[PDB]
Structures are given as C-alpha cells and as structure tokens.
Design a protein around this nucleic acid. Structure first.
Lengths: 48, 117, 110, 142, 55, 150, 103
RNA sequence: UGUAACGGGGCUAAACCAUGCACCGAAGCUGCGGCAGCGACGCUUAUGCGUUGUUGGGUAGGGGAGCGUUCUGUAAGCCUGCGAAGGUGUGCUGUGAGGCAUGCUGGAGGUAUCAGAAGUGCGAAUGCUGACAUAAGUAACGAUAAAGCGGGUGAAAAGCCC
RNA sequence: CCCGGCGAGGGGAGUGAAAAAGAACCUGAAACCGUGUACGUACAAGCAGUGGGAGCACGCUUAGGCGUGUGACUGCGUACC
C-alpha cells in the first residue's frame, strides 16, 4: 500500500458534536441545552 | 491552526447578492436586507406555484363560460352535457379552442345541448 | 482625441463642485469658458482652471482647432476626506470631515 | 404551449346604446359591469381592458324598487372637520342625474388603473340625445 | 426633531433636484470694445455703452 | 493579556454596550477565548497491537513483492557515489535498507541521499516501511526481526 | 389541422409537424411513440369529437431529446421558529415531433 | 373622526323556508413524472439488486449522513511566467452545504486521492476596531464696541501695510 | 516641454517588462459617491416581492422563435431575530 490508502474501519470515528453552528446542524442556537434555567448557563448545574 | 474566514464569507455574500440582482433599493446592495428579500422571494415562489395552478384554471373557466354563453348555453350545463355525453377534454384545451376556433366549440355546444335535454 | 485633464484633491466639497459641473456638460468650449467666467461660485474658478488646462493640453499635446472643441465628459468624484475635531458643549467632541474632490474634464472635436 | 392572452394593440371594441327606462338600477348596472369588463368575450384576459364602449340614454327614468326612492342615501365625505354630506335618490335624480348610474357602476368594478379605464369607457347621458352618432353604436338589450 | 429612519438616494435626489443653478442667458457684446460683459454692468476694463467711465 | 483591571466606562448611564474589561475576547487587541496550551498529543498502543500491526505490514509487503532479501549488503568505501552505483545496478531509486548490525560504512554514504534510509533491525517503524517504494533487508536482519517480533 | 390527445395524464393540442415537450417517456431517441388516445381531431371544419379514444385516428411522434428543465428552488421558512429548508428540483421531460395526423 | 351593525355595490329578490339537480372550490384525493426512509420478500448476502406495501409538517430535543476552510503525511510527486493564489464575470452541474470549466484583472504560488489535528463556518450579543452613509450642503461661524473710503502689495483685497 | 500663482495638481516626453508599479506607490473587495447607455416612471396608494404578462431595446437564428435587460397592467402578499 501507499501511505494515502489506510482507512479506518467503519464506525470508528464519530467526528463529534459542534454546538452553535446554525439551523442545519440540528443542535445550534442554545446547542442542545434548551432555553433558560440553571442548566442553560455557562458553568451552570447542580452538584452531585 | 488559525483559519481566516474572509474569502468564504465573501463567497457566501456574493452567492446571495447574485440571486437578488434586481430588487429596489438597498435590497440589492446590503447583504442583510438582500438575505431577507431572497428568502421571502423563495417563500413567494413556492406559494405562487400553487397559486398559478389555481389561477389558470379559473381563467380557463371564465373563458369557457364567456364563449359558451355567446353560443347559447351556460357554463354549468355545458360541463354537465359534456360529462353526460362522456367527453374528457379538460378545460385548458376547451379554452384554447374557445379562443381559437368557434366552429368546433359550436359543435361541442350542439353535442352538450343534445346530451342535456 | 480624449485630451483628459484632472485636478486631484481639490480642497472643496464634491457636491458643490458637482453643481457647477452640471452646467458645462455638453458645450462648445468658448461658451463654457465665458459661462465659468461669469459665475459667482468658487467651484467655477476651480473648474475654469481645469478647463483651461484641458484646452491647452488639447491644443498643445496634439495639433490644433480650438474652435471645433466640445466638452464631452466632465465628472467630479469624491477625494480623500481629511479629519479634524470640533469641540462642542458639555465635553463631547465632534469629528468633522474636511472634504476634497477630484475634478476631471474631457474635451473633443466630435 | 402557453395559454392565449390578448395583446392590447390587437383589441377591437364595439359601441353600444342602453335605454334605462323602467329597468331597475342594480340589475342594469350589473349587466353594464359584465359588458364593461369584457366577460362576454372569449378573448378575455384579466389584465387587459377588453369590454365594449357603452352609451346610455334616458338616465333619469331609471327606477328603484320598494321605498328606495325616498330612503336610499348616497353618502360621501368631503374630507374636512366633520362635514359629512349626503343626498337621497330623487335629489340625485334632480341634481346630478347621471351620477346615480356612475356611482352604481363604479361600485362594481375592480379598484386600480384598469378599473379606472373600464370606467372611462362608460358614457352616460341624461338626455335622449347623444353626440356619438359618428361612432355608430348598435343596440344591445339586457 | 430627530429623524425616524433614513431616507433613500431617491428622496435625497428629489430634494436636490431643485438646486439646479441656471446660468446667464447670454453676455452682451460691447459696442466699442467688442468684449463680453453682463447686461447693465460695466466691462472688466471699464467701457460701458461706449463710455470709458473708469480710466 | 497585558492590560488593566478597570472598566472602560460606567455600567449604567452611557449609551454604549456594557463592558467589564478591555481584555475580553469580544474586543479588538484582546483575545483567545479558549486558549491552547503546551500539551502532549502522543497516544498509546499496546505491545501486541504494535507487534501484530508490524506483522501485518511485513506480510502485506511480501504480498506486494517490495520486500527483497539479500545476504550481505557490502560497500567498503563510504563514498556516496558507490552506494548510488550499487542501487543503480539493482534498479532501486528509493529504498529502505534494514540491517542487523548498523555498520557505519553504510550509514555514512546514505545521509546525503534523500530517497535512501538505512536503519537497524531494531529501528523498524511502520510509516517508513510503508513510505518507501522498496524495502530491502539483509537476511541477518530477517532472522533478527523474526526473533524480536515473535 | 390540429389533434388533441393525452400524454402524461394531461392533454396537448398538437399540429402537424411542430414539436411539443411533455412527460418522461421510457423511449430511446431515434424511436417513435404512438398515441391512439386522441380526444379530438380537427381538420378544416370537418371535426371529429367522440366518446374518448375516439375512433381510428392516431398520432405518430418521433422523440428528439430528454433534457431536464431549469432548476426550481424550494425554500420553506417558518417565521421566528428557527427552521428553514432549501431544496432544488429539476424535472425530466421529452421532446417529440408530431409527424402524423390520421383520420 | 367619516356613512360605519351585509365587506362594498346593489337586491323586493341577488331575502327567508322546503324539495331537488348541476357547477365552482384546498398544498385533501386521483392521474402522470421524480427523490428518500422503513417493513417484509427473493435474487447469491461486492449486506448489494429486484418486487411489493407503507411513510416523509415540525419547535425544545434525540439519532443518522454529508459539504467547505487552515495546517501535516502521500509530496524533492503533480499544475504553473505559451500565466498560480486572490478579484470579477459568464456557462454547465448536484437533493444541499457546494463543485467544475472559462473570459478579463493579477504577476508566483497552489495542491489531487485517502487519512490526521482543529484558534473550522456569523445577521443580530445597546458586541469591538476601521471605513463610509443619513439628517444636509441643514444649524452654526463663539458677546449687539461699528465700521467707511483712497493709495500700496499680489494671480486674487472688506480683513494685510499706509 | 505646456496649462498653472517662477504654486499645488495635471497633460505630454522619458525609465521600466509593467507608471490604471509615480513615492497617498504589489493585489486592490464591499458599503458609499458618480458619469454614459437600454428600458420604465409626472391620475396613481401600502414589507416593494412573486405567478401571469404587453411593448420596446440590443444579439443571433432551421427566419419558426429563442436569449439577456427593462418590465406598463394584474391575482396573491402586514420584514429578520
């Protein structure tokens, strides 16, 4: 093989979620957090 | 790896302003108002595809009604006679003949009048 | 022949110079020079200077025939606007623009 | 192929005479509006004025049904402080005799430039004379 | 006193349409000088209806 | 960011936006929101994963016939024209030459050659095996990579 | 001289020799599609209307091309509810040259 | 505030009631053309190919699949001063992010394919910096102690010198 | 060399491969300001578009019509977050 033919097995990489990137990515504009509240704030959330 | 997003923002704004070439005022120049104008033009094109499919049928109905009433039968009894004589010529072609050739439309009036009474 | 002559960074506004520039667009050059002579505007003096420079360049750098000549195309565009600061009441400043302009005249026989 | 449309420079028109004696105002004005829009011709397209010219003789003999001679009121506002005027029907027979048919046909037309042109086609006259004899108006009967 | 939203180039151009400076009609030709001047004004060198009034 | 801890104006009263400090990443000449750091991106592979991967790479190299075995690869002089000649004879423009003892007389005359790398039997790495257009090893190094991997 | 027939669930009033663009027909280019499903045949003033698929007369057409139309763009947009959708569409067609009007 | 309690014209029916038949009427349904998902079914499962039924409005959200930008490997290879990037048009192309070809400007860099890492995608944050608009050739020209003429200088004089 | 105030600024000539590389100097975008040409616009009312569409304007051309620009007249239609 050459070094530009090694592909991973299918389902290895998932490429992740990128929150806040528009209407088309699904999540975006609140990025999955929903609307206001303690769970929506920067560094928000209850303790264990 | 820092990405400078100038060239792609220029491509993205020119992609809009080439579509809004022809609107009045700063809907042709300003990117923001041209963006609103472009999506509003898209919604209008969708709704007006449906509206065209209604409006042209109502135009053909008005033409068939006028050309039939000139020949001596009203429109509703014309279509009743054309269906009870089993003629499946839809209204676009009937309006086309009703404008172009009065002879075949008069023959269709005779067939409908014979089929009615 | 085009015989362009321009004056760049003319220290006056572009609009006020443009007002007298719309006077002589499409004239025979003698009527233009006398009508810029008898105008009561400073921009008339500016465009008269540019017009004599254009007429002299059209008679010098190529051959002749001043009487044939007709001002085809004159235009004034806006030049580099320089900034100052105007002090106003209650401590707030105002950035005011001293505006400059480019005057350009193009005369020809046809 | 597309559908047919009437080009405005191709339009032919006819001239007509209506006798309004004893025919009621609304039904006569209805037939005038139907003839004025061009809905009697097969070459009808809604953005082109196609309807015929119409001349009306005997415009103050036109009668209304029931008690409408004395009770129907034709309001209009002068656009002022609160000066809103009116007239009854027979006062409009006396004062502005053709204007009853003018308002009654203007109410039944589309509102815009094209409605204004097809209202310009209407030539009402109170007297039994008409100066459009050089136009040769034939007779149509509602 | 404050404006509401900004007008266009048309509503500026319509208002600036009335600022068109018109010229003089034609200059008078003097009798004895041949020089141009305005009507009822003296020339640039001083003659006026054939009368050297400022010399 | 080299800057002060002071608000550029009042909180309420001035018509501009609220602002806490001139260092916040919204402003110009103040910056990076999520700052990058000196870090280490090296990630772990098992011994058996690396060993099986090298076994797979060598077996695939044999099944593509790039792996050539000679008994002794011998130059006596460290002049690079000699090694260029010996690779001119065997039609090898670009090689990876694994040896079992890294004798200095071949490591010397390969350093000015770009297309030639000469490594030791313990020095086998995957991307340089895959990278070069030919891989030659002494049979001594064949036995040595038999003993080290298995 | 015109014949009224049905091609793609809809009617066309064709004339002899001219071309019409209609629905996609699974037919190679150098071929001939026949329509016995004519609804009216008019020549001169001798007209033929009938209870449909009238009698005898047919239409014989030779396919010219199979191009797609110009791209229509479909934009759905809901005001202030964070949803827009863009979707192109290009419709197939078939160009036929009507070359026969029967009895 | 202007008729102003049919939407208006107008209607003694173009109103109300009863029977009845035509007809119009939506993105409903049928027809024709195309896309995608799911369930089964078999062809020999390049887990594809086909036959069939069915489904496809969507916010918060959940899941799947992609396009593009910078840098690294492939790449001391490829394109390129008989013209690269960038700029600006035009024309084809895809379901979409987009791509491809090419006119003109430019005057020396860009980079296939497949992988990898991300300062990776802006219309809004009374966002930040810069440029420029609008009001606009509009208000104002900073004490109501006051200027007028002649001569000079200069291309030009109400303001400078006498 | 010429206009110009023995100015600024410009038109020539010249250097340079290039001067729309001229010291405000590689490329040179958009907003903004114009000049010219084609069409529309001085009795017609509104998120300024869109569906239909006449006429004119250049281009061609299997001489049928298409293409691009303007789009009178018209049904629908109360911006984005």
């Amino acid at each position: 093989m050459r070094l530009n033919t090694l592909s991973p097995a299918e389902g290895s990489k998932k490429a992740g979620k990128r929150l806040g990137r528009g209407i088309g990515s699904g999540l975006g504009k609140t990025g999955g957090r929903g609307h206001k509240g303690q769970k929506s704030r920067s560094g928000g959330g209850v303790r264990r | 790896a820092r990405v400078k997003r100038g060239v792609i923002a220029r491509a993205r704004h020119k992609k809009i302003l080439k579509q809004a070439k022809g609107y009045y005022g700063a809907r042709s120049r300003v990117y923001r108002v041209a963006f609103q104008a472009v999506i509003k033009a898209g919604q209008y094109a969708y709704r007006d595809r449906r509206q065209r499919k209604r409006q042209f049928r109502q135009l053909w109905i008005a033409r068939i009604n006028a050309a039939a009433r000139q020949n001596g039968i009203s429109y509703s009894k014309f279509i009743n006679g054309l269906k009870k004589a089993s003629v499946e010529i839809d209204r676009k072609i009937l309006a086309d003949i009703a404008v172009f050739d009065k002879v075949a439309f008069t023959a269709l009036v005779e067939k409908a009048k014979a089929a009615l009474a | 022949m085009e015989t362009i002559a321009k004056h760049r960074h003319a220290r006056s506004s572009a609009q006020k110079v443009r007002l007298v520039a719309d006077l002589i667009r499409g004239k025979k050059v003698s009527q233009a020079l006398d009508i810029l002579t008898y105008t009561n505007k400073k921009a008339a003096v500016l465009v008269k200077k540019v017009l004599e420079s254009a007429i002299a360049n059209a008679e010098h750098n190529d051959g002749a025939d001043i009487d044939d000549l007709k001002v085809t195309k004159i235009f004034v565009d806006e030049g580099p606007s320089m900034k100052r600061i105007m002090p106003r009441a209650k401590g707030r400043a105002d950035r005011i623009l001293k505006r400059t302009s480019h005057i350009t005249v193009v005369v020809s026989d046809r | 192929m597309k559908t047919f449309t009437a080009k405005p420079e191709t339009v032919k028109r006819d001239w007509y005479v209506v006798d309004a004696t004893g025919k009621t105002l609304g039904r006569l004005a209805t037939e005038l509006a139907r003839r004025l829009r061009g809905k009697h011709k097969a070459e009808y397209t809604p953005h082109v004025d196609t309807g015929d010219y119409i001349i009306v003789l005997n415009a103050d003999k036109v009668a209304v049904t029931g008690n409408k001679r004395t009770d129907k009121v034709y309001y209009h506002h002068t656009g002022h402080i609160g000066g809103i005027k009116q007239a009854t029907f027979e006062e409009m027979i006396a004062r502005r005799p053709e204007r009853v048919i003018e308002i009654a046909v203007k109410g039944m037309l589309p509102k815009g430039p094209l409605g204004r042109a097809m209202f310009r086609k209407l030539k009402v006259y109170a007297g039994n004379e008409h100066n459009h004899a050089a136009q040769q108006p034939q007779v149509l009967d509602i | 006193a404050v404006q509401q939203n900004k007008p266009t180039r048309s509503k500026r151009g319509m208002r600036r349409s009335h600022d068109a400076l018109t010229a003089v009609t034609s200059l008078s030709v003097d009798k004895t000088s041949g020089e141009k001047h305005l009507r009822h004004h003296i020339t640039a060198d001083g003659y006026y209806r054939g009368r050297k009034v400022i010399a | 960011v080299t800057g002060s801890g002071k608000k550029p104006w009042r909180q309420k009263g001035t018509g501009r936006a609220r602002s806490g400090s001139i260092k916040s990443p919204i402003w110009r000449s103040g910056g990076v929101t999520f700052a990058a750091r000196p870090q280490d991106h090296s990630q772990k592979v098992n011994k058996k994963m690396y060993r099986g991967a090298l076994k797979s790479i060598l077996s695939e190299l044999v099944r593509q016939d790039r792996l050539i075995v000679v008994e002794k690869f011998s130059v006596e002089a460290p002049k690079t024209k000699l090694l260029a000649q010996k690779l001119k004879d065997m039609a090898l423009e670009d090689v990876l030459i694994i040896t079992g003892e890294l004798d200095e007389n071949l490591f010397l005359a390969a350093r000015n050659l770009h297309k030639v790398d000469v490594r030791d039997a313990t020095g086998i790495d995957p991307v340089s095996l895959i990278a070069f257009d030919k891989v030659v090893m002494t049979a001594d190094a064949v036995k040595q990579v038999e003993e080290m991997l298995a | 001289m015109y014949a009224v027939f049905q091609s793609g669930g809809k009617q066309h009033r064709v004339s002899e020799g001219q071309t019409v663009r209609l629905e996609k027909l699974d037919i190679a280019t150098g071929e001939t599609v026949e329509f016995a499903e004519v609804l009216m045949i008019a020549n001169g003033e001798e007209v033929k209307i009938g209870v449909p698929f009238v009698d005898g007369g047919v239409i014989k057409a030779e396919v010219v091309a199979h191009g797609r139309g110009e791209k229509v763009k479909i934009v759905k947009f809901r005001r202030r509810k964070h949803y827009r959708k863009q979707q192109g569409h290009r419709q197939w067609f078939t160009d036929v040259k009507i070359t026969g009007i029967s009895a």
